[PDB]
């Protein structure tokens, strides 16, 4: 009888449940609203969450994320040899064409195909959801993007099956955004929506149309390649020039353990300019036992950053020209993803639609989830949400 709804992420998962017409976000066992879709495998354990992500450095071989770049797909598609480069674990084609993770867990060679990967995050926020209510959780309505085909959709349906759980329906993410707004219970009739979703490692731009309460896919575009990681590496970059300026010469990039811990903290500083005008990106023994310390204003990480913010209405303006439409005819524009709560980027956003303001009101790596766990009560009988 219990449904929840989840956002299955390419870099982090979340999970939402509607009860009694309202959606609760729930939180996992360190307190965080979305868990990384990180899977780890140790000499004694095999890590799901915030603690496969925190030895991820520690440990780069047998660290399994991006399972979403894999699911459903054949190991020889174009972009599985191109994202392969990004991956310090081993992935490998089988003889049905389907890829194999391959780690090593309690000193044995494991393999898994994506969807497994795929089934371990999603039990994770199964069992996240039933801490929470007490109770066994056995339904889930799973968010996919929108470009996905029937083989990613199928195979994430699968790997909910594997996770123990009964799938009611895939939906796409755009449209479990629009949802959680409740931009489909308003009577104005006719509405375009754009959804600018912009997470960890992906970047969505959806145009939909609602009529009579259903939404409709106009166009979709973006940039698979650009999210938050591209924008910790632009500080990434920069520290280890200032390593060098610092230090000699010296270049930090030739360790790939300096490199991923300086990464890390990139990755936070980049959080706290979302809110701070400046912020201290700090490794002790980062290199060679050199201590490493520098202070990064909001201005700087901007023009850092400066052509791939400006670059996200690139994606925009091809939704609009597709869908054979004017920027004036968009009624609500939706802020979806971790990185929208980059000042830059929303008023980039805002600029463009020529000062609307965006919809930004839910905790925009939570919108996808929220509007998953709706689905997943109307789906259960429960019309309370409208
Ligand atoms: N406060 C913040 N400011 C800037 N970026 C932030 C942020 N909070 C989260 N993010 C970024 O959001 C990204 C994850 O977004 P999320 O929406 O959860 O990922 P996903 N798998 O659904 O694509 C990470 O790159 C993270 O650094
Ligand atoms: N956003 C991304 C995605 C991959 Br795969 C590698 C780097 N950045
Ligand atoms: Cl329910
Ligand atoms: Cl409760
Ligand atoms: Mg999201």
Redesign the pocket.
Known sequence: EVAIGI?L????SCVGICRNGVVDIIANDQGNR?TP?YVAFTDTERLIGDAAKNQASRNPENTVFDAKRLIGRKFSETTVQSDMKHWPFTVKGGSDGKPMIEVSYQGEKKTFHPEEISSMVLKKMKEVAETYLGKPVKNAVITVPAYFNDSQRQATKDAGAIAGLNVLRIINEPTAAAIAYGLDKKGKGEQNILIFDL????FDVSLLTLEDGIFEVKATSGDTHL???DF?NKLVNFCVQDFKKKNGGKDVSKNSKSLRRLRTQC?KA??VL?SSAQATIEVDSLFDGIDYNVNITRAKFEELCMDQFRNTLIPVEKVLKDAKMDKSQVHEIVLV???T??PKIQQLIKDFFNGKEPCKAIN??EA?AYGAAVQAAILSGDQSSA
């Open positions: 956002d992420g390419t870099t982090y979305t879709s997470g960890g490692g992906t999210g938050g990681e910790d990755e980049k959080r979302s993803g971790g990185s709560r980059i925009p790596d996808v």
